[PDB]
């Protein structure tokens, strides 16, 4: 798959993921401060048989922003595509929803480009 | 076009739009408080020759949240589709960007369904 391992966004965050043979993604997302309190569980799914002709491999994952240190009462999902080669990347769009505020103004949208080397 | 006139979202906001023969949209968006300070300029575009076979008519508009009363240093764009008939609707998704905060966490996403009758 080429997905298993460590990936870096352009803001200093990291995640570390294992891609299972079945389509499972499991790992840890680490925000840019990089300490214990910056580590969060992630889980998701990916296409374990992508088109050989196509551009990439579809995938998505979720982080709920609670760990044993802190709780930001929110969750982010990243939806995107892994592209292999010499400059491998995971191109994503993300949705960050807050649990605390009313739903219709609760969700931020953005994008992240993950690489195998740091920015 | 069926677009010119007044439309209501499901939260109590209104807008009033004129659809020009050329594709122009011009009007006023009025937030749910409904007073002078709640009125904002809107401008946008629409498909002035939609497919006769298709589901609807593509359109979009922008409101910058400044009027002569107040300034929320932000802008919302709605992108969507007008559907005619007895229960006409404009189905939209929107992006609200703040100017003041750093761009990567600056944009909320949501949706609005506009009807010709109030909720």
């Amino acid at each position: 798959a080429g997905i298993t391992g460590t990936w870096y966004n352009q803001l200093g965050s990291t995640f570390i993921v294992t891609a299972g043979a079945d389509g499972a993604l499991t790992g840890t997302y680490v925000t840019a401060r990089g300490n214990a309190e910056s580590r969060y569980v992630l889980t998701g799914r990916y296409d374990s048989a992508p088109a050989t002709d196509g551009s990439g491999t579809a995938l998505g994952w979720t982080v709920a922003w609670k760990n044993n240190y802190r709780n930001a009462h929110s969750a982010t999902t990243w939806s995107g595509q892994y592209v292999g080669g010499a400059e491998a990347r995971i191109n994503t769009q993300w949705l960050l929803t807050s649990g605390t505020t009313e739903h219709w103004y609760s969700t931020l949208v953005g994008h992240d480009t993950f690489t195998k080397v740091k920015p | 076009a069926g677009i010119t006139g007044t439309w209501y979202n499901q939260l109590g906001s209104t807008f009033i739009v004129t659809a020009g023969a050329d594709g122009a949209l011009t009007g006023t968006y009025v937030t749910a408080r409904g007073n002078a300070e709640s009125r904002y300029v809107l401008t946008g575009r629409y498909d002035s020759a939609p497919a006769t076979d298709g589901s609807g008519t593509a359109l979009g508009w922008t409101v910058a949240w400044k009027n002569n009363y107040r300034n929320a240093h932000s802008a919302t764009t709605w992108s969507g589709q007008y559907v005619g008939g007895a229960e006409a609707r404009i189905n939209t998704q929107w992006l609200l960007t703040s100017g003041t905060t750093e761009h990567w966490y600056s944009t909320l996403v949501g949706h609005d369904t506009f009807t010709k009758v109030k909720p």
Binding site: G12, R33, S38, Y40, A72, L96 | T101, E102, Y105
Partner: peptide
């Protein structure tokens, strides 16, 4: 959201 963990510096 500037203080949310996702965007922390």
């Amino acid at each position: 959201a500037w203080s949310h963990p996702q965007f922390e510096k």
